[PDB]
């Protein structure tokens, strides 16, 4: 028994709620919150900017030191850094960006990173396909992640189509 509340059971290990992950992070203080990062860990907008803003830019300061030491992540890769005031840990995961010509097939490799953590609060990845084929992103999560994932979905048009499609 964990502390996630109001999430709907989608599958054996996947749960889903209509909410802003940042606001959910401010609440539960989970062991792991997932960030939909870019390979430079430049947290300008979206989940990254919203998470980073909620940390008063401490996430960005830590991230810049990480990149200066290690260089950029791979698309489909991840790193574990501090969760700051939002979680014990933040798993920064890079999904492919179709807007930059990156290959959507890398989405499965991105979700595989979740399997290194028993329980995670996470968003859907590759938001660049959210108008073209939003269902594609959630199908991969369910078919790839075997650990317990609590998905916080921001868009209500989306959540309704998603839960409808998988029930
Ligand atoms: O900006 C924020 N939050 C914030 C910002 C951005 C997101 C986000 O990239 N989600 C991913 C997503 C969603 C959804 O979540 O609807 O659907 C999808 C379909 C396909 C692929 C991906 C997705 C999530 C949360 N907060 C600030 C104003 C206070």
From Swiss-Prot:
Free-text function comment from the UniProt entry: Responsible for the cleavages located at the N-terminus of the replicase polyprotein. Participates together with nsp4 in the assembly of virally-induced cytoplasmic double-membrane vesicles necessary for viral replication. Antagonizes innate immune induction of type I interferon by blocking the phosphorylation, dimerization and subsequent nuclear translocation of host IRF3. Also prevents host NF-kappa-B signaling. In addition, PL-PRO possesses a deubiquitinating/deISGylating activity and processes both 'Lys-48'- and 'Lys-63'-linked polyubiquitin chains from cellular substrates.
Name the UniProt record assigns to this protein: Papain-like protease nsp3
Domain Macro, first and last residues per copy: 1-167
Subcellular location: Host endoplasmic reticulum membrane
Stated regulation of activity: Inhibited in vitro by GRL-0617.
Gene that produces this protein: rep
Domain of life (superkingdom): Viruses
Complex formation: May form homohexamers. Interacts with N protein.
Reaction catalysed by this enzyme: Thiol-dependent hydrolysis of ester, thioester, amide, peptide and isopeptide bonds formed by the C-terminal Gly of ubiquitin (a 76-residue protein attached to proteins as an intracellular targeting signal)
Membrane topology qualifier: Multi-pass membrane protein
């Amino acid at each position: 028994v964990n502390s996630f509340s109001g999430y709907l059971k989608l599958t054996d290990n996947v749960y889903i709620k209509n909410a802003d992950i940042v606001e959910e992070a401010k609440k539960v203080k989970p062991t792991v919150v997932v960030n939909a990062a870019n390979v430079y860990l430049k947290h300008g907008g979206g989940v990254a900017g919203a998470l980073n803003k909620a940390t008063n830019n401490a996430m960005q300061v830590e991230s810049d030191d990480y990149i200066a030491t290690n260089g950029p992540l791979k698309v489909g890769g991840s790193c574990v850094l501090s969760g700051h005031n939002l979680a014990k840990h933040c798993l920064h995961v890079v999904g492919p960006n179709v807007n930059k010509g990156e290959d959507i097939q890398l989405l499965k490799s991105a979700y595989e990173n979740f399997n290194q953590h028993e329980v995670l609060l996470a968003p859907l990845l590759s938001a660049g396909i959210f108008g073209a084929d939003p269902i594609h992103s959630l199908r991969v999560c369910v078919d790839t992640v075997r650990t317990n994932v609590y998905l916080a979905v921001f868009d209500k048009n989306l959540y309704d189509k998603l839960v409808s499609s998988f029930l």
